[PDB]
Design a protein around this ligand. Sequence first.
Ligand code: 6IC
Ligand code: GDP
Ligand code: MG
Length: 168
Amino acid sequence: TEYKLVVVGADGVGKSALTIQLIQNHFVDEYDPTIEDSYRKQVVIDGETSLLDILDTAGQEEYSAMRDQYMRTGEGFLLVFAINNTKSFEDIHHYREQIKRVKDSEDVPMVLVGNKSDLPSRTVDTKQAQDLARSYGIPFIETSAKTRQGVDDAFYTLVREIRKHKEK
Ligand SMILES: C#Cc1c(F)ccc2cc(O)cc(-c3ncc4c(N5C[C@H]6CC[C@@H](C5)N6)nc(OC[C@@]56CCCN5C[C@H](F)C6)nc4c3F)c12
Ligand SMILES: Nc1nc2c(ncn2[C@@H]2O[C@H](COP(=O)(O)OP(=O)(O)O)[C@@H](O)[C@H]2O)c(=O)[nH]1
Ligand SMILES: [Mg+2]
């Protein structure tokens, strides 16, 4: 099965670092902050061979019709913030609403991802993120793209959310 996964959130939260951890199994310090691109990873998840096509979003904020239609083809979304950046957490509502807007649905597979969990300079409490994810009805996964903590869990959980959505 193929899955179109989309990684969204504010600049600097670690979308590209998370993506490259999944694709290449290491931490890329410098990934061009402006570049939006996609990558495939083939993996077996709960016994099913899965082709994950991951869109790592970036670039200028714009809402062209092409862009709405492209985002609408995403099947599941990682809502990424960084635990050291409160503005990135406050921006999660916006990304969730843009997904709901283009998919014309209140029920889109999503996972809330609190990245940079290796850093000591926390300004977003785990409880804040758990409360937000509970209010959205979605899982919350703590990650570090630096150490790889939680990375497979975030992507595989999103795949499991898509499978559950298909059966509703
Ligand atoms: C993603 C996505 C996205 C979706 F998931 C779903 C559907 C979408 C349909 C669209 O047509 C288009 C998008 C889409 N594309 C790019 C965005 C973006 N950029 C600028 C920077 C920060 C990330 C990256 C890309 N580089 N930024 C903000 O918002 C930033 C803030 C801060 C300044 C003002 N805005 C409004 C809020 F306050 C938050 N939204 C964006 C957005 F919705 C969509
Ligand atoms: N310590 C730490 N740094 C991170 C982590 N994820 C990303 N970074 C760093 O944060 C910056 C922004 O990461 P990037 O992947 O470009 O974020 P993007 O703009 O969301 O694609 C870079 O300096 C990364 O090396 C993480 O989990 N831990
Ligand atoms: Mg990036």
